[PDB]
Design a protein around this ligand. Structure first.
Ligand code: K1C
Lengths: 169, 169
């Protein structure tokens, strides 16, 4: 159950820090980008570093203003987020702050390291536990007040998947 | 055993990324800072965000040149490190890149969240497991070739603790 600690690490070291400041950073940029942080959670733990090559309809636009803070002895640790435009039939259908959930890469990499004691076939179960644990945290989290939306999916169109969550907003 | 996953997360998401580039970043700054990344691992999981207030003899000097990379959909994710001067009896005794091991904060914060299922009295055991696991990884890690030194300590002078590791180098 490594995913339990990674989900709490994902909340303690990231979400609870950046979500309270997220609205103000989006308003600063707009002065339109949506008001939520959209987190992609592929359950196969396949996490590309370049979103534009995961789906051509996902196109990088710009970055939010950086958020900095002193963290564990590091002066001005930088928290940066990227804004993407979502294309549909050659039309701009939405604009939002979009990114993958990084700890899913940790699950994938542990499955490949023999010293990690992590079976290759346990990725799907741990990914589902990571999503379930993060859902339980964010549902009760005060830092999250319509601040982010989890997008979990099993791939048997990624931009169509994100747009479906956008249109409900 | 949440610490096992945090240690592998600490290596997969940080050390294996920044350690291969660390020497070149230090050489760029020197053109003197020591050649190793010194990681503080307090076993009580007490991790101040400001190193200068943990010990007055630890004084922030400057930052290394930033390292950037596309990470999980985030364009130009920033990896920054701080350089500290270590004072002894009013004398500059050493200069090195110094920081705490951030996941120890995750252990501490989980101990305070009732939903995390982490006992307050398990911090010391998990901290020791985190250090032990990280030691096993770095001992066999190709990315670490005289690139970093772990500084683990139980507090019954922090600058004297770091200087002892520096003088062996
Ligand atoms: N640049 C850095 N400087 C100093 N230390 C660093 C740095 N980078 C890594 N580390 C180490 C490795 C460990 C796991 O790293 P990971 O696998 O990327 O998991 C993260 C990620 F999913 C997210 N996350 C946090 N910050 C950001 C951000 N700025 N942008 C995007 N995502 C972010 O939260 C998780 C827990 O974060 P953490 O700080 O508690 O643990 C970190 C920390 F210990």
């Amino acid at each position: 159950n490594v995913a339990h600690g990674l989900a709490w690490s994902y909340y303690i070291g990231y979400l609870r820090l950046i979500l309270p400041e997220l609205q103000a950073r989006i308003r600063t940029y707009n002065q339109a980008v949506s008001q939520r942080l959209y987190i992609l959670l592929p359950l196969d733990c396949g996490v590309p570093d370049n979103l534009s090559m995961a789906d051509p309809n996902i196109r990088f636009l710009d970055k939010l203003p950086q958020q900095t803070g002193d963290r564990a002895g590091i002066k001005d640790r930088v928290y940066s987020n990227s804004i993407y435009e979502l294309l549909e039939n050659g039309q701009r259908a939405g604009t939002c702050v979009l990114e993958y959930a990084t700890p899913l890469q940790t699950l994938f990499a542990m499955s490949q390291y023999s010293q990690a004691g992590f079976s290759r076939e346990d990725r799907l179960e741990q990914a589902k536990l990571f999503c379930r644990t993060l859902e339980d945290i964010l549902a009760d989290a005060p830092e999250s007040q319509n601040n982010c939306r989890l997008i979990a999916y099993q791939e048997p169109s990624l931009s169509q998947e994100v747009l479906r969550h956008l249109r409900q907003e």
